[PDB]
Amino acid sequence: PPPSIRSCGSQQYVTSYIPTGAAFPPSSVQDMISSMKSYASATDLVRTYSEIPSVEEALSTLDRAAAALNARRYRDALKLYLEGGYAMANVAERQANPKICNLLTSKGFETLNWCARLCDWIEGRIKEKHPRPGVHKVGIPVSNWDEDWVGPFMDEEEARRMWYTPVYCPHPIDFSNLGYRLRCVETGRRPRLMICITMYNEGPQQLKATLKKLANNLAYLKEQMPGDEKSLTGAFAGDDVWQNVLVCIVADGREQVHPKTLDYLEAIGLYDEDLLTINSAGIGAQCHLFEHTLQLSVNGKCLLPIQTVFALKENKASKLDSHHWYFNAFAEQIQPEYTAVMDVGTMLTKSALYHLLFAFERNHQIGGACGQLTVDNPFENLSNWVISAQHFEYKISNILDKSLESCFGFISVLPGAFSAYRYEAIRGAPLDAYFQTLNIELDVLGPFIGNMYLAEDRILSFEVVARKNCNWTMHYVKDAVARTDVPHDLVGLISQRKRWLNGAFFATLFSIWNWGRIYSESKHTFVRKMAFLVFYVYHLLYTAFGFFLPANLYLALFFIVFQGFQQNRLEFIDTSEYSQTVLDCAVYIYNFSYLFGLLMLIIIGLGNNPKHMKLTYYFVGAVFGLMMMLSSLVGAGIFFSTPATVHSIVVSILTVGVYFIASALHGEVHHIFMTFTHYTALIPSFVNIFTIYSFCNLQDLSETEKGDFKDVIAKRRALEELRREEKERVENRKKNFEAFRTNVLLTWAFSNLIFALFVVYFASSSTYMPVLYIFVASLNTCRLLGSIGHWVYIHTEGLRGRVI
Amino acid sequence: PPPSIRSCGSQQYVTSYIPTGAAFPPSSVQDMISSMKSYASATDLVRTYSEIPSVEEALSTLDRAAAALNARRYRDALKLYLEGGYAMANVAERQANPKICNLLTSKGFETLNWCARLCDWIEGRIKEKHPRPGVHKVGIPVSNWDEDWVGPFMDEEEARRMWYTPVYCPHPIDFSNLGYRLRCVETGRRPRLMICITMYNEGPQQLKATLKKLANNLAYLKEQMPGDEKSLTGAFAGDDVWQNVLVCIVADGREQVHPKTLDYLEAIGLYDEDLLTINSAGIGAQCHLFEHTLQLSVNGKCLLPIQTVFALKENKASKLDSHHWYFNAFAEQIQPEYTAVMDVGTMLTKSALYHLLFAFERNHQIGGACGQLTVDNPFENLSNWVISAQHFEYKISNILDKSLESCFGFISVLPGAFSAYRYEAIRGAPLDAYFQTLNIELDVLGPFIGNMYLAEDRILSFEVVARKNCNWTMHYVKDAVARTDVPHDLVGLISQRKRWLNGAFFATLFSIWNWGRIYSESKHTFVRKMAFLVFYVYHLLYTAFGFFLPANLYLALFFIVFQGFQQNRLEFIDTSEYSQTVLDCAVYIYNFSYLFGLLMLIIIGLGNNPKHMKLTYYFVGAVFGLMMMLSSLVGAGIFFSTPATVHSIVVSILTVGVYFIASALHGEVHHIFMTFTHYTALIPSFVNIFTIYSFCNLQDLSETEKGDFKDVIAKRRALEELRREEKERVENRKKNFEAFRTNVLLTWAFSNLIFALFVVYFASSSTYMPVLYIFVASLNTCRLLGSIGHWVYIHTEGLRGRVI
Numbered sequence A, B: 001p002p003p004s005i006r007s008c009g010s011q012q013y014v015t016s017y018i019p020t021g022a023a024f025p026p027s028s029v030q031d032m033i034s035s036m037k038s039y040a041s042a043t044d045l046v047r048t049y050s051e052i053p054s055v056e057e058a059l060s061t062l063d064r065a066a067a068a069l070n071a072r073r074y075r076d077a078l079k080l081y082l083e084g085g086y087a088m089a090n091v092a093e094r095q096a097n098p099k100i101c102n103l104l105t106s107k108g109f110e111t112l113n114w115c116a117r118l119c120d121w122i123e124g125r126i127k128e129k130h131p132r133p134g135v136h137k138v139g140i141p142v143s144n145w146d147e148d149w150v151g152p153f154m155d156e157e158e159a160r161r162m163w164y165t166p167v168y169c170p171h172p173i174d175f176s177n178l179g180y181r182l183r184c185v186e187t188g189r190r191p192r193l194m195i196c197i198t199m200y201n202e203g204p205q206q207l208k209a210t211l212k213k214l215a216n217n218l219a220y221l222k223e224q225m226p227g228d229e230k231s232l233t234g235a236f237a238g239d240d241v242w243q244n245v246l247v248c249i250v251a252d253g254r255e256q257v258h259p260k261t262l263d264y265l266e267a268i269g270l271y272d273e274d275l276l277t278i279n280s281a282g283i284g285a286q287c288h289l290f291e292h293t294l295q296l297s298v299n300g301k302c303l304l305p306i307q308t309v310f311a312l313k314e315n316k317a318s319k320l321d322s323h324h325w326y327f328n329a330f331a332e333q334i335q336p337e338y339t340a341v342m343d344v345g346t347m348l349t350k351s352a353l354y355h356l357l358f359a360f361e362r363n364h365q366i367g368g369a370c371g372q373l374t375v376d377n378p379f380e381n382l383s384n385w386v387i388s389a390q391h392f393e394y395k396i397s398n399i400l401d402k403s404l405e406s407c408f409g410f411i412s413v414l415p416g417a418f419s420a421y422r423y424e425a426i427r428g429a430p431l432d433a434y435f436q437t438l439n440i441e442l443d444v445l446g447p448f449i450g451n452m453y454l455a456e457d458r459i460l461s462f463e464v465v466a467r468k469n470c471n472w473t474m475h476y477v478k479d480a481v482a483r484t485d486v487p488h489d490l491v492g493l494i495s496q497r498k499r500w501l502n503g504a505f506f507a508t509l510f511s512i513w514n515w516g517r518i519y520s521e522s523k524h525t526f527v528r529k530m531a532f533l534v535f536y537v538y539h540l541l542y543t544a545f546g547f548f549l550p551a552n553l554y555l556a557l558f559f560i561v562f563q564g565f566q567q568n569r570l571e572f573i574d575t576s577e578y579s580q581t582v583l584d585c586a587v588y589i590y591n592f593s594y595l596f597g598l599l600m601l602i603i604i605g606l607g608n609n610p611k612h613m614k615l616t617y618y619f620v621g622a623v624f625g626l627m628m629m630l631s632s633l634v635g636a637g638i639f640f641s642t643p644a645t646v647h648s649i650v651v652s653i654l655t656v657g658v659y660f661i662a663s664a665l666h667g668e669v670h671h672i673f674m675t676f677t678h679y680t681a682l683i684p685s686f687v688n689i690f691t692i693y694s695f696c697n698l699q700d701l702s703e704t705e706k707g708d709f710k711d712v713i714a715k716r717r718a719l720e721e722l723r724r725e726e727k728e729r730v731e732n733r734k735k736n737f738e739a740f741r742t743n744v745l746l747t748w749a750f751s752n753l754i755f756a757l758f759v760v761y762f763a764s765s766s767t768y769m770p771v772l773y774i775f776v777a778s779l780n781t782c783r784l785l786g787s788i789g790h791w792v793y794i795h796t797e798g799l800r801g802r803v804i
């Protein structure tokens, strides 16, 4: 018998006893149910409220329907889809905005048709695998259209209408199989060059500058006369070049996109929030792609139209995921000839694309090319030391390293922007190895492959060069200048260099380990293999020298400056005087200051993020810079005081003047003169701070419908077990990666410490400095020879290309 | 005019254009709607499927209803609640299990009554604030009941029925206002002692042992004869003590509770999953509380019944949150006289509760007491060095520190288990300051208060002692022995000591800073204030000495051992011989090994969690232990070789033999003899490893119903803005806490380094060692005097308490 539970929910507190022995007898619950009339009032109120539907309710029901369909429960999905479709169809009449009314009507009809198809599938009449709502792209007039704009010729359908479609494709390789198409393919156009602009959390100005620069490049390509020896022929000839270029702007996530960037994109007719909100309600799309042929006008001059596809991903991922989508989906569908990759904010000169295409067409053996990277407005605000140091570093790195590596046809491209490939060398295995992380969990790959983060460009380069049964070489184009924007403070530079150094070190180790594939698998000429062997020996020596850089810097400074002051080896001054306390005071001050600075740096770097420790980083950098400037002045005095000899002048030239000689040979000598002083004061800061922080922060890295009660309990237990197992797996992965990074850091730090201690204790300045001079002179001589060879090639092969 | 969109969802790919200029004309959409018949088939299939309801659907609808009600949308909540109630009422008939049928019927009726009340509230007839479903507790027969069990007397309602209720109370202070009651209050019983057992991720064995020990304590309290001078009187007298004790088992979260623990709890009639799943569907409770009077039988002996309340929190929180719930809700409702707190696994002896209650009743000035903490089975498995070291540490800490601090009536209770208070001293301000973190966000409090993590017990102790207009002192009971289980490896010890050291250091700083409140605000006797001033001076000296412990240890070892070997100061051997290379080799080996070990330790501690670095920690600990054992042997030889004098023997006694003297005075001398050797080998490990890791890881720490389209857009924009602001706030908080911890670590490390360097360079062994000996002898003499005073008090106040 049921107890007196008539008022158990209404009253604030009720205590009841429920006997579970033999259940409640029938004919008693019915009387209690029929004896209550307030339920009728509640039902009447609910029905009256539920007569009128709403947009928000319909969208929520469609979202729940998509969630149910993703869980492979089809009856609930069908019911929710029917409810949402009927709700939207009823609501569409009430709306006063014509655009909203039309979009709601179309969405309701589409949802109802999908419901009918799903019902047919459930009944068994239609046999398919993993049914999804049919793909449907909607074209709408652009809100803002410039009446006064002059272009070559634009069909009204292409000129005034922007197209939108949501894509659910989980693996981008299936983009063309699921039935998705692009406007270029439908219209019959077959673009031959594709440019990708990865964007994440950026202001409108950078995107505007990038688009203007691309339009200028297209105009320059159009302007060139035909029939010249240096003019390109074919698709990129003239008066139709804009039809052979497609620009893909891939964003990283709706959550992190700057709102002003979205406003600017909507201004140029490449984004609309109402269409995205309505048309993507039930699909549960992974990405949303808008398509347009944007027409940009700057000041009183009208630019050429640019065919643009803006792909906005729903959830945030890495840049490698953006390249995954771009390459696989768009490249496999369009099947272009070339493929250029650049970041947002990279401003190109008028001739970058022309030079890239000219090299690709003339050589026919180049599988990839990279342009020169420069700092925007270096001379302006020259009082900033960080900007000038970065400018000097970029110029020297480009000239020496790029020339030397491009002589042998193998380039380890610097991170960031403006690298072009041809979609024949990279289509197969190189791209499969490029996207290895995105397809295989880091548990299977291991710690070494996982820690190769943000170094995927070097992996792609090495895969292209060492591809089996093919001989593809890389090239460096000096005239394809791309200007970027660099951080103006030490903290951003520290973070950027952390990323760069992690990637560079582990990619270099991978290349050194796998260099044998060039001889074992690739098909090159014998001379190419011998040249690659020579470059391999040079690369081993260079990496080994770079690993021991802090110890060598400390030893050089200590010996020269301070054991010249203490032991009377400075030539311009005599220290045979003095009380023997000042000399030891200087040596001890140097040692203690260096040790304390290194300890503070390592503690801070391993400890916390370098944004709230700005003052300490600035203080350590200033101390090291003053020390380096004093050492430079002392060394200059020592060198000038000596009457000099053949050995002295040869070593001085091959050590210091190689930079000036190469810069003068290439014509970029004024930048070196302006920025050498600024770069000199940051060498210890660069080496110590960046390497220590990079090593310390290495850890940073990425179906029952109804059921009964027993089914519910089993489902909940299974869910809890799966959640706990996943948590344990993630913990184990983090533990392994942290252990690997700690082992690497300990090895590096203790190797450097032991080397420095042994050289200090068991070696003199007379028996160590000549070895360092020989090593540095040899490396710089090799780099200078490489630069001269590249210059000779680039200025001669045009004249001597007739014979061979 | 609408385009040909008849087949847009069914077909795989359809491209359509939607003109937004002037909307679609009427009389055309109606024809298309009425021209489609597949929608009728889909509707028929959906209706046929939806005729039959299910348990899972009803539970999901009720959960969604609770979610809607929490968002203050009442129409949707009413509609979902009605649907769920009707679904459950329809389903309840189909079930075959009588318990499930009865529970479903009761839940359906309760939900329908709540729907009626909510409808009345919406219509305006009933005026309330924040309506919620009415509180309803359900009593069910226990699944397993022991027929053969003999007890004092048990009403069948109390003996066979277990009660359950879900609580939604967001702020536990409102527990009694919302209408919740406990079975003890309803039955008329008024328990005078409450015991809290906090549990999180523990095996059944620990809980079983704790419950058995509590039952043994109750039996011992019952057994004592009346009329004796030492026997308690009143509630705890005899034959009814079990009615005056309530045990609250507070779990930390359903997700992290060990499944075997839940099985054991269900075995003893304190948990049931079906009742929890059904009765908590729509409430959205914060916690679930089960109530029973459990009857435990071990072997052939039957234990006394224990009144138990098991409170299981839905989501995981800190132990401070469990104490928040326990203290506020249960203590404020029941209003007990005492309040004991212990962890799970703490096994009490037969006389712990008797001694605690005896002290509380006899003294009448004690506001809090703590029992002795011991290691379970210390002699067993004596080959383990960590267990013996922990046993020695516990014994020495208890004796010396607890006796000295309890002489002055102010105890800084060690973390973990078995502390009792009286619910008159702590009811007001002390508990408000105890729960300060749980009520105020860490942004307002600042970094210093936030970093005082896991130190709340010391805060409560100091608040009790320094409470305004009151004179409450603390006490240490030696005979209330509680045995715990200690980690058997170095990694668990490292983590445990990290928590303990963070809490202890910041609580000590807080107490030192706020010590003035005792004189400014409290109301003590003049003699008490003078004694507190003396203890304050001693505490300052002890903390200052403890801050510089690594440097002093290094200096002592270096000077004595190695500058005895190098400079011929070992008395049992002569080093005037030797080549002058072995001596410097020994000194350099010591310095380099110590520096490398410290560098490795700090890098590992700041770097990664100490579970995958087990081998390196073990290696460093072994090296330090061998060094300490060698130093101990050398020091023993040096001391024995000297013929000795008054100063030597006095310093030796007051430095080393204080431990043995105090242990022999208190009778616990054999433990010291057994474990002194094991503890000696871990002193450098303790100091260096635990302090470094603790400092390094200091960072670780804790409404529109319908709307239109514009409303939806505004709502989504507001949600995105709020999410981004919250993310920024969390980032700023993390940055501030990390900066504070890094500053503290840098200050500590560099202070120790500079002190050691200056003492090494500018001081000799003759001018430094006597100062260290004086300091250590003074501290140990003060501790010995405190221990002797406590022993005299505990053995005399019984005899001399008649006069005063």
Ligand SMILES: O=c1ccn([C@@H]2O[C@H](COP(=O)(O)OP(=O)(O)O)[C@@H](O)[C@H]2O)c(=O)[nH]1
Residues within 6 Å of the ligand: A198, A199, A200, A201, A202, A252, A317, A318, A319, A322, A343, A344, A415, A416, A496, A499
């Ligand atoms: O998680 C991210 C971070 C950045 N980027 C984009 O990838 C490029 C490189 O990012 P970043 O500016 O950080 O490069 P860096 O300046 O550090 O060399 C830029 O276009 C970013 O917008 C991205 O797609 N995902």
Ligand SMILES: O=c1ccn([C@@H]2O[C@H](COP(=O)(O)OP(=O)(O)O)[C@@H](O)[C@H]2O)c(=O)[nH]1
Residues within 6 Å of the ligand: B198, B199, B200, B201, B202, B252, B317, B318, B319, B322, B343, B344, B415, B416, B496, B499
């Ligand atoms: O997040 C937590 C961790 C622990 N505990 C409980 O609080 C007590 C102290 O935990 P622990 O065993 O970690 O203490 P320790 O052994 O570290 O001193 C034990 O009863 C735990 O079950 C808790 O309530 N919440």
Ligand SMILES: [Mg+2]
Residues within 6 Å of the ligand: A343, A344, A345, A346, A484, A485
């Ligand atoms: Mg950039």
Ligand SMILES: [Mg+2]
Residues within 6 Å of the ligand: B343, B344, B345, B346, B484, B485
């Ligand atoms: Mg414990």
